[PDB]
């Protein structure tokens, strides 16, 4: 025997007791259990279960067999998860493969002692073969390989290892490339600042008494052709600083106009920039509730007492008509692959690979602490690695299933992220309705399946929802919350003398605190294969035309349809009142229309919307990051073009991302296209967002357009 | 004496669940979550024990309950969701008694006549100031209940006012040139006239229809074309589009293309018939109710609140966390949200006096005979309140909703109770906010939204409206569009056929011989916001990239052009989602000295392509008559009688009597009671996926508090 509540709760399950029915309801992920004290059986997801040892109440607390959790939860009656006997080829590197891959490169003579690992990822087999596995179950007969990107001090080396034959295939130093920021870079930064008298001296003049309460925060310095006075070949980071005052929120305590430049290889400050002295804002601004009492609230549960409609086999997810593969990358996070829609018995391709391509959070302030500030979260910091374990019931609904995911840390040791991804089905209003006058109503409810992932980088937290509608539509939403980066200012209200200058670049959200204006710009890489590899990009611009057909009408609503033939033309602004299809010239629906998916890069947002990059076309950030200033891109599929901002965007001098990918202006006619959607907000701060910002959402959509022959949700014929 | 539980509870409208293992019934109905065991002497209502004289009885696997079980339980009082109102809110709708009274009073007048019908019988609104004072200070409105009675005498409109407190007629005003909306007996009348028409049956025969009794008609308003349509301006007319009933329950899927009959409702006779080319009626059966479909298995998913709701409904007053508002029902525009305040640490702060659907238009873009005049002003011309569609419990709204009934007057002046007319439901909407500081304990709270949902159906469209209250002070308004499409009969089976290009010039070919004629849905919401008070100003904030004049390597910066919008004419404008438009109160500021404001977002997105305006050339009449179609934002000085964007009597109107009229005098909007109007819509290009039945498509609008508060609104009560 072992006590129930204690055991169940260490296991992560939710325990409810109902005195009226003398019934225990146990819930974890897909398993929904009902068990009575002294009963010889139980119920798991609607199904009966014989028990070796019944539950016994001693002194009013239940006691269970030391074998209970296994017997009941791993009983096999929770069918949410199934064994994958034949591993999908896109499956992420396992802990073993991660360790194997590190052994191989550590065994080369070229591997230098304190080398770190920026990324250790599956080297993807060729697309054709993966599709073949998913559609025909044809074994992919190449060995598992891994890209091993190393950082030797400040030097980038790309290696490829063969895991089947346990041997090194190649070792390539990458010239002029800078490495992303690694975890230990954060400690140096702080450690190096701590040991500098010059810095302790600057801090003191700034009105700070205890230098050991100063918090560093490291930032990439971008590239300014030398105008920032920084060397190109040295590995650099700028340091912004705050003051810990004990409120658990150093962000609310900026030390404005103090910037330190740190050379991570000389391990010392190579430059201090000082500006007007500003009193650090002192007022405690906690956000974690320490100073609050939440109002009582009636409970709300979302229950699926017979288990889930989806089934997770290894990393393969089957839900209704959808099948797809969900894996984890240390840089961009989740990757949705081999997505198909089962049209009445036939699996048709929709998407080969979909994922966050890359993002950036650039600021609009000229001053010394801000002008270089632009966050390439995934690219520079690694958003997968910094995944934030989903908080059960809060970050995701009470009926979610939470998945664990494994990647490699910067020292090459496997790393299991708990509750890394949330999978939950949700009611989304009525799928469709007609109430014909004097007739029985017709209503069916809409279900969506959501794959939710949260990554936290410094002060923001970002949420991403990959949303699968029953009817074939796929949504992609990005949410933003967390703590704003604020500029310390003298003014305490808008009546103060400095208020005007103080707010030229942001709103005054708290006394002495201004939320500098910025943008959030997300870019999603979507290798759609619309009912096949070979597609074309078609515009339909609804327009008003003169009526030629007679009658009283002077005008009509018609459409301008034309193919978009190349990559340069495909890289365009998006007008939400126009229609953009990726069509399959080769296949047609019942009515003779090319099967297509409608692409909607802006389907709404709760913050103001970016129409492009709020940067003059001669700014360096603008020249380097093209993807910011166009909402739609379409390129020819090539296996190594995956990042809108480039593979090595840290202090890049030119554009190696979508700018480079479309530079060559290849043709997009009946060929394999990759869609890139850029959507962003322009954030003008306000008091309601301080000291912690309510989640703001942006929406994007991919709709079937004559992909089907009718309403996809009516069902099969009798 | 006893009765079958299961059947009785179904009539009564409650969900029933039997758990054989626990031998336990779980019963659900609105705010009532009940648990009862067979033979047990007590039951559980919202977590509270209730005693039963007569327990539930199991008899050969059939449950049985006494004939008072349903009252004893669901009206016990342990369900605290609904409370009774001590002092009646002055904004409460006309009761059934008040309706019947207002009708007696006018029938007592010299000039009343037996054919006279009632287009709208609605409370004459008390003055804003008295009403507010009631909500905020609790001061009795000492002004007497009156009711606006709009009658239709044959084809003439008359506006009568009745004093209900004193049971007297106050006024009786004939309105020249005004045409009345379409009424219910109009539908019946039109079908009859066609069925008695010798010519029409002949026209129908030519077009391959072998049985005319099978011809389903449908009435549309005709609009105005300065006589170009050949229609005398002053007669009460309706054009008639026709379909063939094939027994598939979907007559919409079988158009009789190019046959249009004009009907004079006074003459009760077909005054004109327009005929075009003969096009074979699409015959294939295309039901949407699933009769020909397989019902797959779906595992159950309940959203439950077993201790009751967080909101309370007292009369028509709804209280939920910091929100307080009054909810009622107009026969024309449906639900009305009034005296909306937000409670800030003890003090109720004004947010909105009155919000509701202003009006909507669904105009088509095809110039042919059966399409060129076609634009529906659904609320204005057909009365959307009256055509409210009862909520399909569990489907049209989630399993944890409470469904309100609402009472209006019908067209003969008889009270009419609409069951499940409005849905109220709280919903989880992700994390309110979150920060997971590296190395630290996470911080996350869940977001809750209270939704007020209403569905009205007009012919083939079904529209859904959500009024959404975020705990953090934000208000959302989404409009959903579903139902069946008005399709055009054409000759082409596929795009390969010879006439495919011609047949699809004005719409997509979504099925053999069927085209989804392009059109738009344009919604407009009239929002009498009072941001922390009546006197407001409209402010603009345009994020711009200005050259950097402060040194450093930056060539440019992100700054903001702020300016007031001083008058109505300037306030009537397009909305660019990259800009910020506030309704600020210039008399009140937050802790930081910023004017407390609400940010107004008429376009927060949608699932159909968005309409940038009216897709009409600027010389079309419908464009002329309806200026509200072409700007997304309007603000006007509050005036009690200015409620409709399309104008109060839009049927065959000849000039804008709505938002064009309201703002034409270009009044000042500086520090004055403002009314905000938001227009938003979709351009609907059809696709096979939307046939035979259209998946619900949504558009979102948003109202965010902007420096209205001093801090994150949902942090919680301060401990010091
Ligand atoms: Ca592709
Ligand atoms: Ca107002
Ligand atoms: Cu932001
Ligand atoms: Cu439509
Ligand atoms: Sr290319
Ligand atoms: Sr006016």
Swiss-Prot record, chain A:
Mn(2+) binds at residues 527, 529, 672. Pfam families: Cu_amine_oxid, Cu_amine_oxidN1, Cu_amine_oxidN2, Cu_amine_oxidN3. Ca(2+) 2 binds at residues 567, 661, 664, 666, 673. Its cofactor is Cu cation; Zn(2+); Ca(2+); L-topaquinone. Substrate binds at residues 375-386, 457-462. It is an enzyme of class 1 (oxidoreductase). Keywords: Calcium, Copper, Manganese, Metal-binding, Oxidoreductase, Periplasm, Signal, TPQ. It is found in: Periplasm. Inhibited by 2-hydrazinopyridine. Topaquinone (TPQ) is generated by copper-dependent autoxidation of a specific tyrosyl residue. Residues 644-665 are annotated as: Disordered. One of its GO terms (cellular component) is periplasmic space. Its EC number is 1.4.3.21. GO terms for molecular function: calcium ion binding; copper ion binding; primary methylamine oxidase activity; quinone binding. Ca(2+) 1 binds at residues 527-529, 672-673. The modification 2',4',5'-topaquinone is found at residue 460. One of its GO terms (biological process) is L-phenylalanine catabolic process. InterPro entries: Cu_Am_Ox_Cu-bd (IPR049947), Cu_Am_ox_TPQ-bd (IPR049948), Cu_amine_oxidase (IPR000269), Cu_amine_oxidase-like_N (IPR012854), Cu_amine_oxidase_C (IPR015798), Cu_amine_oxidase_C_sf (IPR036460), Cu_amine_oxidase_N-reg (IPR016182), Cu_amine_oxidase_N2 (IPR015800). It comes from the Bacteria. Belongs to the copper/topaquinone oxidase family. PANTHER family: AMINE OXIDASE, COPPER AMINE OXIDASE. Homodimer. The enzyme prefers aromatic over aliphatic amines. This is Primary amine oxidase. The gene is tynA.
From Swiss-Prot, chain B:
Pathway: Amino-acid degradation; L-phenylalanine degradation; phenylacetate from L-phenylalanine: step 2/3. The modification 2',4',5'-topaquinone is found at residue 461. InterPro entries: Cu_Am_Ox_Cu-bd, Cu_Am_ox_TPQ-bd, Cu_amine_oxidase, Cu_amine_oxidase-like_N, Cu_amine_oxidase_C, Cu_amine_oxidase_C_sf, Cu_amine_oxidase_N-reg, Cu_amine_oxidase_N2. One of its GO terms (biological process) is amine metabolic process. Mn(2+) binds at residues 528, 530, 673. Its EC number is 1.4.3.21. It catalyses: a primary methyl amine + O2 + H2O = an aldehyde + H2O2 + NH4(+); 2-phenylethylamine + O2 + H2O = 2-phenylacetaldehyde + H2O2 + NH4(+). GO terms for molecular function: calcium ion binding; copper ion binding; primary methylamine oxidase activity; quinone binding. Ca(2+) 2 binds at residues 568, 662, 665, 667, 674. It is an enzyme of class 1 (oxidoreductase). Substrate binds at residues 376-387, 458-463. It holds the Pfam family Cu_amine_oxid. Inhibited by 2-hydrazinopyridine. The keyword Oxidoreductase applies. Cu cation binds at residues 519, 521, 684. Belongs to the copper/topaquinone oxidase family. Homodimer. The enzyme prefers aromatic over aliphatic amines. This is Primary amine oxidase. The gene is tynA.
């Amino acid at each position: 025997m072992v006590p129930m509540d204690k055991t169940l709760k260490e296991f992560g399950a939710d325990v409810q007791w109902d005195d009226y029915a003398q019934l225990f309801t146990l819930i974890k992920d897909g398993a929904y259990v009902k068990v009575k004290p002294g009963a010889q059986t139980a119920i798991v997801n609607g199904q009966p279960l014989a028990l070796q040892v019944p539950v016994v109440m001693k002194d009013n607390k239940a006691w269970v067999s030391d074998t209970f959790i296994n017997d009941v939860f791993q009983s096999g009656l929770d069918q949410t998860f199934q064994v994958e006997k034949r591993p999908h080829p896109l499956n992420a590197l396992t802990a073993d493969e991660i360790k194997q891959a590190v052994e191989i490169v550590k065994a080369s003579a070229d591997f230098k002692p304190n080398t770190r690992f920026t990324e250790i990822s599956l080297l993807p087999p060729d697309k054709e073969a993966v599709w073949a596995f998913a559609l025909e179950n044809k074994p992919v007969d190449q060995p598992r390989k891994a890209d091993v990107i190393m950082l030797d001090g400040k030097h980038i080396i790309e290696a490829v290892v063969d895991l089947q034959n346990n041997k090194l295939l190649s070792w390539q130093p990458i010239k002029d490339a800078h490495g992303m920021v690694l975890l230990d870079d954060f400690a140096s930064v702080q450690n190096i600042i701590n040991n500098s008298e010059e810095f302790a001296a600057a801090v003191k003049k700034r009105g700070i008494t205890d230098a050991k309460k100063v918090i560093t925060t490291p930032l990439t310095v971008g590239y300014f052709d030398g105008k920032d006075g920084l060397k190109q070949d040295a590995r650099l980071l700028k340091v912004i600083s705050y003051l810990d005052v004990g409120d658990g929120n150093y962000w609310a305590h900026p030390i404005e106009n103090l910037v330190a430049v740190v050379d991570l290889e000389q391990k010392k400050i190579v430059k201090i920039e000082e500006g007007p002295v500003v009193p650090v804002p002192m007022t405690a601004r906690p956000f974690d509730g320490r100073d609050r009492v939440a109002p009582a609230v009636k409970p709300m549960q979302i229950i699926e007492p017979e288990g889930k409609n989806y089934t997770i086999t290894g990393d393969m997810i089957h839900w209704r008509n959808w099948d797809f593969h969900l894996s984890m990358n240390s840089r961009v996070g989740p990757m949705i692959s081999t997505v198909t829609y089962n049209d009445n018995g036939t699996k048709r391709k929709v998407m080969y690979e979909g994922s966050l391509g890359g993002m950036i959070v650039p600021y609009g302030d000229p001053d010394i602490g801000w002008y270089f500030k632009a966050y390439l979260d995934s690219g520079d910091y690694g958003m997968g690695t910094l995944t934030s374990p989903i908080a059960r019931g809060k970050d995701a609904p009470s009926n979610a299933v939470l998945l664990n995911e494994t990647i490699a840390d910067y020292t090459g040791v496997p790393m299991e992220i708990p509750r890394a991804i949330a999978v939950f089905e949700r009611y989304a209003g009525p799928e469709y309705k007609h109430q014909e006058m004097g007739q029985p109503n017709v209503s069916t409810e809409r279900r969506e399946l959501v794959v939710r992932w949260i990554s936290t980088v410094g002060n923001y937290d970002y949420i991403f929802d990959w949303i699968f509608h029953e009817n074939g539509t796929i949504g992609i939403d990005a949410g933003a919350t967390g703590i704003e980066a604020v500029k310390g200012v003298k003014a305490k209200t808008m009546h103060d003398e400095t208020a005007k200058d103080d707010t030229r670049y942001g709103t005054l959200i708290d006394h002495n605190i201004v939320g500098t204006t910025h943008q959030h710009i997300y870019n999603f890489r979507l290798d759609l294969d619309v009912d096949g590899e070979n597609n074309s990009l078609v515009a339909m611009d609804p327009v008003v035309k003169p009526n030629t057909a007679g009658g009283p009408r002077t005008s009509t609503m018609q459409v301008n349809q034309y193919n978009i033939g190349n990559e340069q033309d495909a890289a365009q602004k998006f007008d939400p009142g126009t229609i953009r299809l990726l069509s399959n010239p080769n296949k047609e629906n019942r009515m003779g229309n090319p099967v297509s998916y409608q692409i909607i890069p802006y389907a709404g947002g709760t913050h103001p919307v970016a129409k492009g990059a709020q940067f003059a076309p001669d700014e360096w950030i603008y020249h380097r990051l093209s993807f910011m200033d166009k909402q739609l891109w379409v390129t020819r599929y090539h296996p190594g073009e995956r990042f809108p901002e480039g593979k090595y965007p840290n202090r890049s001098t030119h554009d190696t991302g979508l700018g480079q990918y479309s530079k060559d202006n290849e043709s997009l006619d009946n060929t394999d296209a990759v869609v890139w959607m850029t959507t962003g907000t322009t954030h003008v701060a306000r008091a309601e967002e301080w000291p912690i910002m309510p989640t703001e959402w942006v929406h994007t959509l991919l709709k079937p357009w004559n992909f089907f022959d009718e309403t996809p949700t009516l069902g099969a014929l009798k």
